[PDB]
Amino acid sequence: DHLMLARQLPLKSVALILAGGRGTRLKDLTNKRAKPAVHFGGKFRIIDFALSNCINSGIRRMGVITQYQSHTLVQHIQRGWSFFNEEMNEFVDLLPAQQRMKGENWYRGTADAVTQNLDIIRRYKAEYVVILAGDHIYKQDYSRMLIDHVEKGARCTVACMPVPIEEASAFGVMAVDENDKIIEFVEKPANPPSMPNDPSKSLASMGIYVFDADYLYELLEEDDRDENSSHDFGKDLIPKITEAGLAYAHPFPLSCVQSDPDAEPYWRDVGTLEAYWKANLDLASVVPELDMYDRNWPIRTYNESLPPAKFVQDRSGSHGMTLNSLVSGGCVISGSVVVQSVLFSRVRVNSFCNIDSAVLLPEVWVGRSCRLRRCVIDRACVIPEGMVIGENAEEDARRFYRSEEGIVLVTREMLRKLGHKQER
Amino acid sequence: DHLMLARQLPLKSVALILAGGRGTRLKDLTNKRAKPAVHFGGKFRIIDFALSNCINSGIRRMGVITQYQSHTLVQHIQRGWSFFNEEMNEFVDLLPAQQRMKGENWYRGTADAVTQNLDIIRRYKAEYVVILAGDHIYKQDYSRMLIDHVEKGARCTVACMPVPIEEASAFGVMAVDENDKIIEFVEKPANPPSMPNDPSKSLASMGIYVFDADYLYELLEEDDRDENSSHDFGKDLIPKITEAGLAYAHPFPLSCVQSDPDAEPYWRDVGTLEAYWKANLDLASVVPELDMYDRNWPIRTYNESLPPAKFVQDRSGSHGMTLNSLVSGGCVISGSVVVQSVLFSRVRVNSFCNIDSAVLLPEVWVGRSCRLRRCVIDRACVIPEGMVIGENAEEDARRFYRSEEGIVLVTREMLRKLGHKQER
Amino acid sequence: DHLMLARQLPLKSVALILAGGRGTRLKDLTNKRAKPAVHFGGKFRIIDFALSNCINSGIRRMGVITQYQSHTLVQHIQRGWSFFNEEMNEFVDLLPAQQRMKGENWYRGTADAVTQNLDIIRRYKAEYVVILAGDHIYKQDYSRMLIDHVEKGARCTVACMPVPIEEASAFGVMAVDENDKIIEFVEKPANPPSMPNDPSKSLASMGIYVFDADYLYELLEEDDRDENSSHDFGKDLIPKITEAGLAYAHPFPLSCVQSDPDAEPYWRDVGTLEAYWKANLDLASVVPELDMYDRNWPIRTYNESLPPAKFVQDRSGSHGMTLNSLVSGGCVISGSVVVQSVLFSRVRVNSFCNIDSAVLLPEVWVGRSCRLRRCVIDRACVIPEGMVIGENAEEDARRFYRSEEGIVLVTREMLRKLGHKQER
Amino acid sequence: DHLMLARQLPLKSVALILAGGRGTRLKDLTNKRAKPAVHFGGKFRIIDFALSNCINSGIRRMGVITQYQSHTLVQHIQRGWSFFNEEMNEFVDLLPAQQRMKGENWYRGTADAVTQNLDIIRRYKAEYVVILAGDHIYKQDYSRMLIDHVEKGARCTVACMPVPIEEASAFGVMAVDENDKIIEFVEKPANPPSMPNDPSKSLASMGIYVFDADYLYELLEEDDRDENSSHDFGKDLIPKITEAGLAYAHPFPLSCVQSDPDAEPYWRDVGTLEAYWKANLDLASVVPELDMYDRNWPIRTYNESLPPAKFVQDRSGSHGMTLNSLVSGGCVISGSVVVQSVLFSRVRVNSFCNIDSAVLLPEVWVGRSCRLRRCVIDRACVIPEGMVIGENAEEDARRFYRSEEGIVLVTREMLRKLGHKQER
Numbered sequence A, B, C, D: 001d002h003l004m005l006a007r008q009l010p011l012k013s014v015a016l017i018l019a020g021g022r023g024t025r026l027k028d029l030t031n032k033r034a035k036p037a038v039h040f041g042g043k044f045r046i047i048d049f050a051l052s053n054c055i056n057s058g059i060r061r062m063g064v065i066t067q068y069q070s071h072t073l074v075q076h077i078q079r080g081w082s083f084f085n086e087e088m089n090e091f092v093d094l095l096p097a098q099q100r101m102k103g104e105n106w107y108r109g110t111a112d113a114v115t116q117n118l119d120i121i122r123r124y125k126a127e128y129v130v131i132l133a134g135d136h137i138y139k140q141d142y143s144r145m146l147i148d149h150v151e152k153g154a155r156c157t158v159a160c161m162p163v164p165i166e167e168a169s170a171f172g173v174m175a176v177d178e179n180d181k182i183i184e185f186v187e188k189p190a191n192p193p194s195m196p197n198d199p200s201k202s203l204a205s206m207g208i209y210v211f212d213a214d215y216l217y218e219l220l221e222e223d224d225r226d227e228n229s230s231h232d233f234g235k236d237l238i239p240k241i242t243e244a245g246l247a248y249a250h251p252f253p254l255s256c257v258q259s260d261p262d263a264e265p266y267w268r269d270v271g272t273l274e275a276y277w278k279a280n281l282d283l284a285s286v287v288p289e290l291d292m293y294d295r296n297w298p299i300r301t302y303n304e305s306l307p308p309a310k311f312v313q314d315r316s317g318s319h320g321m322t323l324n325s326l327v328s329g330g331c332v333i334s335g336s337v338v339v340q341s342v343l344f345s346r347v348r349v350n351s352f353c354n355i356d357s358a359v360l361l362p363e364v365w366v367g368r369s370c371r372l373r374r375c376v377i378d379r380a381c382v383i384p385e386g387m388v389i390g391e392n393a394e395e396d397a398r399r400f401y402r403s404e405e406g407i408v409l410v411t412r413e414m415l416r417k418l419g420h421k422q423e424r
Ligand SMILES: Nc1ncnc2c1ncn2[C@@H]1O[C@H](COP(=O)(O)O)[C@@H](O)[C@H]1O
Pocket: A032, A033, A037, A038, A072, A363, A379, A380, C120, C123
C-alpha cells in the first residue's frame, strides 16, 4: 500500500454500467424507455448518477450496456456524455447487442451481456472492472472501494449495505465475518436472512461488484459454457466466487459521499412507482436527503438550453402561489397554485390549476381549471380542461393506473383511450 | 440574381463584432465589464444577440474585437461560443489589440481596430465584410441584407431604421433618395435632421455596415495615413463613402425576424441605465416585445448547468407569491413576494422580502426582510438584512447611484463603502 | 421562386441516412461492421460522405438508421459527429430498431425502417425529407436538388445519373421525358434498358430521394399495410409514385461539387472488393478524381489525435523509398519501399518490406521481410515475418480471399486459421 | 499522510501557467508569437507540455497568464483546450492584464501578474497554488510534488534539478541540506555555485513553485507594496521565503514521468535557437529522449483535421527518399530527399529538393531545386526556386539570421527583404 496508489487504480480501471434492462415494477413509466433513462430530479436521468460517480472517482472509461428501448438513453449519452477525447484514455462506449441476422443475438442474461462484448473489453487493458447497476440512485466514490479491494487482496468485492428485512427479498442478501469476507450469499430469497444483532435488517448487495480483470474473464468463459446457468451476476457467479472464498464485502457507508456526516447513506433504487414519486419530492422538501446543491460531487447531465422559468398572471390578473416546489427551466406557470411538486423542463400549466404532490415530467401541458393530487404525469401528456385527478380513487383507478398506495400515473395512451386528442 | 445566391453569400462573408467599448452611459454597470458582456434576459449577455444572428444567417466566421475589460467577455466566448471546428470553415476569433514593448498597442478608434487586425482578416479571404456593433439587442437576418447589397450593386450598405428625433442625437442620421442611396450622412448631430413626411423622426444608422472587402481594405489604408482623422466608422469613413455616392441604405424592417408581422421592429441599444432596466422587464410582461420562446431564430449562449428553481417556505411556514416574473435556474426563493422582476442564475433571496420591478443579476443574496423596488442589483451583491431600497429617493441617492428617472443601481463597492462587507 | 428560398428549405428539411444494412458483395471486409463504417481515404469512413454533404448543404438535422453490426458506426458518430447543440435545431439522431422482447422487432426492409421510426420523425416537423443511402461516396449539394424539387412542383425527386449498361443491373434504371418526369422505373433489372441516343449507358437511380414530408408519411402507412410488399424504396414505393406521375428526376451533374468543371461527376458505391481497392488508390495517384484538399466542401470525420508519420532507418541503417503513397498519422515505416499504397493510422511496418498497390487499414503490423502486392490488409492484422502476398495466385487463393480480378484480402481470422498468433 | 490524500490534493489545487514572456534569446522566432506558442514536435506548442501535466496530474483548474503577442496562444487554447465544463470543477482561464483608461495596465514583473489577478484567484478557493513556467518542455507529475510538499509540512516547494555549471547562470541556483530545506538561494548568478561532491554541476530551480495559498496571497500583498522590488518570483520572493526557512526543495527525478527508468530526466527550456532545433530533431532520431508514443502520459493539443501525408512522384517520375524524419499531416512531398528533418502540418515541398537537419514549421512552401541544411524555416515561408541554404555560411549570415553554432533561421520578413514576395 503506497502513497500514490489511490490515484493510479482508477486509471487502471474500467466501469461497466448494466444500463440496459427495463424495470418491470415501474408499470408504464418504462414502456417506451429503459429504467436508467427514467427522468428524475427536474433535469436528470437515473444513469447520470452511475456515471458522474465514475467521473468524480477518476474512472473516465465507462461501458454502457443497453438492450431494452434504448433510443432515449443512447440519445442522452450522445448529447450529455460525449465531451470525451479518446486520446486522453477516456470514453463512454455504448455496447448494444450486435445483430447480424435480424434478432439472432439478444443478451440472455446480465452476465451474458459482458460476455458478448468480451472481445472489446479486453482491448481496454483494464485490471479492475467495476460492474455497476445504473438503474439506481446513489452518490458513491469508487476510488475508496477500489482501495479497500486492493488492501484486502480480494478477487471480487461486493458493495453491501443493510436494508429492512421487509424489502430484502428483492436484493442479494449475504452474510459476512470479522474480515468482511462473504460466507453465505443467496440471491433474491423468499425469507431474507437477518443480520446478527440486527434482527430487523438484512445485509444486501447493491449490484456494485469490483472484479480483478483476470478473474472476471476466466469466470465468464467458465460460466458461458454452462447450459444450466441463468447467466446473471447475482444468480450464478457471485455464489460461485463465494463458495471458493474469494469474495469480500465493502460497506457502502465508507465510500459514500454525503454532506452531512451525521446522516445515513442514501440509496433508492426507485423500485416501484411509489418510491419514484417519493424520491423526487424528497428534492422539493426543505432539507433534502439528497444534496444536489453540492459542488464537491456534482452530477453531470444534458445541459439543455432552456429559457428562465416564467410565472405570469392568469386570465383574471391574479397571483400564482408556490410552496416547496421545483420549477425547472422552460416552464410557464400561469397564476395557479403549485405545492410539494416537481415540474421538469417545458411544463406549460394554464390558469386556475391546483397541483399538489405531483411530478410533471417534461413537455406536459396542463389545461385550465385542473386539479392534480398525488400523481405522476408522463412525458408530453396534454391534460385537457377541467380534468380532476387524485380526489376519487374509484375514478382514477378506472381511467389511469393507480397503485395500491394511492399514486396515480398518467400517460398519453391512457389519455388517448379516454378520447382526449393528445397530438398537440 | 441567381436562385442559389442567397445561400452562398453567407459563406463568402465574414462578420466583425466590435465588442470592445465601455458604454459609459451605463455608469457603474460596466465598471468591471465591457458593454457587450452586460447580463440580459435572465441568462444571456448582449453579445449573444450579435452572434446568434450571424449563425442563423449562415455567417459562421466571426471576428470579435475586444479592448476594455474583456476577461468576462472572453471567458464567455470561450465557454459558450467555442463549439466550432476550423476544418468546416467556421470559427469565433478574438482579435484584442496585440501587445509588445511594455503596453504599446491600443486602438485609436473604432476603425483603427479593424486595421491593426488587417493582416489576419485578409487571410480569411472574404468578399463581403459585415461590420457589427455588438453592444446592441436585435434579431436580424444578415443574409437578407447581403442580398439587398448585392442586387443594388452597392459597395457599402448601411442598415438604417427610423427613431424619434429626441434620441436621434446619439446615432448616425442620414438622408436617402428613391433608390436608397445615401445623400447626406452626419454622425451624432446636435440637431438631428428629420425625415421627409415624418417631422418627428430621423433615419438613423444602427452600426451595421456591410462592405465590399476590396473596398474596405483600400479605404482603411487610405484612412490610416490620415493625420486629422478620428479613426471611426461613423465619424470618418461613412462620410467619405457617402461623398463618393457609393453608400446605399438597407431598411431594417425588411431583414428583421419577428414572430408578429403586425408589430414594429425591435431595437434597444441599452443606452442609459433606465433603458437597460426597462428592456429586461419587457421580458417579464405577459406579451414581450422580444420573443425568446422562438425556435426558428434561437439565441445561443453559455448553457450553464444549474439546478431547478427552488421555491421554499419561509421561517414561518408560509407561501411565496409571484407575478409576471422570471426565475432562472439556481435561484432559491424562500417564501417572499416577487413582482415584475427578473432573477438571474444563483439568486438566493431569504424570507420576508418584497421585490418589485427589480433586476437581480447573478449570485445576488438578498437577506431577510428586505424591500427592493425599481432597482438593479449588481452581480454577487450581498444585500444585508432589513435593507430598504426605492422608497426614499433622497436616501437612495447618497447611499447608491440613482438615475434622474428613479432607477437605483447597487454594486458591491457601493455596499462595501457603507460597511456591509460583501465577502460571501 | 423568391430570392431567399435557397436558404430556408434546408432548415425546413431533414435527412435520413439508411446507413444500416451490410454490403454483401464486400466479402469479409464487412463481416464485423456495416458498409457505411468501412474505412476509406486514410482517415475517413464512408458515412462521412453522406453526412458532410448534409452539413455543407445546410441540412443540420440527420437521421442515421443503423441495423447490422453498428458498434463501430455508432462509436464513430459519437466521437466525430456529436458536436451539435439541439437548441440550434441540429442533431444526428441514431435510430436503431428498438427491441422490447429480445429480437421481436428488426427492420424488415429499407422502407420498413423509416416506418418504425415514423413517430420520432413527425416530431421534427420537417417539410422535405431527404432519403440518403449512406453506403456511397460522392460530393453532392442537396440545397441545389431541393430547389430543383421546389421549382418543378414535385412530390418525389430521384437523383439520377448515367452509368454503363454493364453495371446497370445493380441500380434503379428509369426513363424520363422532356420535363425530367419519370415515365418508367424498374428496380434492379436483368436487362437494364439503355438511354435514348446513348445505347451503351443507362439512367440509374443513386438512392437519393427527396420527398415532401406530407406525401412520404401517407405513402409508407399506405404501404406498411401491404403484406405482398417487400418494404423497400426502390422495389415498392418508387414504382408506386412513378405510376401516378408524381416522380421527377434530378440530374446529379447539376448538384455535384467538383473542383474541375471539365471533369465528369464522381460516384463510386464501392460495390465489390475490387472497386474499394481501386477507389482508395485513386487518392494516391498524382491527379485524384476525388479532391480531398478542397476547403470549399470539406469532409468532417473523427479528428483522432495521432503523432506525426515517422520514417526511420532499418536495421541496416538504410533509407526508405516512397512513390505515390499516402501515409497517415501514427504510422512508423522502418526503411522499406512503399508504392501506390494507402497506409491508414497506426500502421507499423518493419524493415525490409516491399508494399505495392496495397491498402493497409489501421493498426496493421507488417513484420520484417514481407512482400505485399495488390492486397487489402484488414484492421489490426499482424502479418508475420517473411510473408509473401500477391505473387502466387494459386497460393493466395488457398490462404486468404482472392477476387476474380486478382485482389487479395487479409483478415485476422484468415491469419489465425493459418496458425499466426494475431493477439499482439 | 492518509491513504486517500494523493487523489484529493489535485482537486484542492490550482495551477498558474505564466505563458506570457518574449523569450528574447530566440531572436526572430518569437517576433510575432509568445515563447509558449512556439511550434514543437510536428504538431505541438510548448504550452501543451505545461498543461497536459496538470490534466494527467488531476489538476483540472489552470490559469494561463498571457501578456506578449498572445493572439496565437489564446487562439490555441480556444481551439484545443476548451473542452472543459464549469459544472465539473475544471477550466482553463485566460488572465491577460485588464485594460482601461487608454492602455494603462501592464504587469511590472512575473509576480506582479499573479497579483493583479488576485481577486479572481481567491474565488477559486484553492489551498495549494502550483506556479508553472509554461515556456518549458518536460513530462512531470505534479501530484507527486504536492505530496512531497504536504509530507514535509512545507509552505513553498521549489522543484530543483541539477544542470551543468556552464548553463547554470540562466536559472535559479540554490543550496539544500539533509532534509531538503533551501539554505541559500540566488537568482541568475554570474558565478553559479557548484553542488557538494559534484563540482561540475549546480542545483537549479526549474520555475515550478508549489505554494500554500494562505502564504502566497500574504506574500504578494506584502511584496506589492515594496518600492525597491522587481516583482519577480525568483528575484524577489523566493529569497524572502528562503531567508525565513520556509522553503523546501523537491527533486524532479522523483516526480518525472519517463518510460525508461534507466535514463535521466528530460528538461529542455529551448533557451536559444540552437537548442530549439536540437530539441525537435531529437524526436526524429531512432531512440528519442522524449517519448511521444506514450499512452500513459499523453500530450493534449489542437487535433487539427488534416489529410494524410502524401508522397508523390516528381516532374521526372522518380521516387522520394526519407531517413529519420517526421512528416505530419497535410504535407505533400513531391519526390525529394528528406533527412533528419521535421515537417509540420501543410508543408508542400516541390520537386528536386534536398532537405537535411531542417525544421519546417507549418504552411511552408519549398520551391523546385532547393537545398536546405541545419536551418529553421518560419511558418508560411515561401522559399523560392533554386534557393540554397546552409552551404555558404558567409552568404547565409547577410541574407538571414545565423547563430554562432551554424543554425540558420528563415522568416517571411527576411525573404521579403530580398524581394521574394511571400504572398501565397
Ligand atoms: N414531445 C413529445 N411527444 C410525444 N412523445 C415524445 C415527446 N418527446 C419524447 N417523446 C417520446 O416519449 C418516449 C419516452 O422518451 P423520454 O421521456 O425522453 O424517455 C419516447 O418514445 C420518445 O420518443
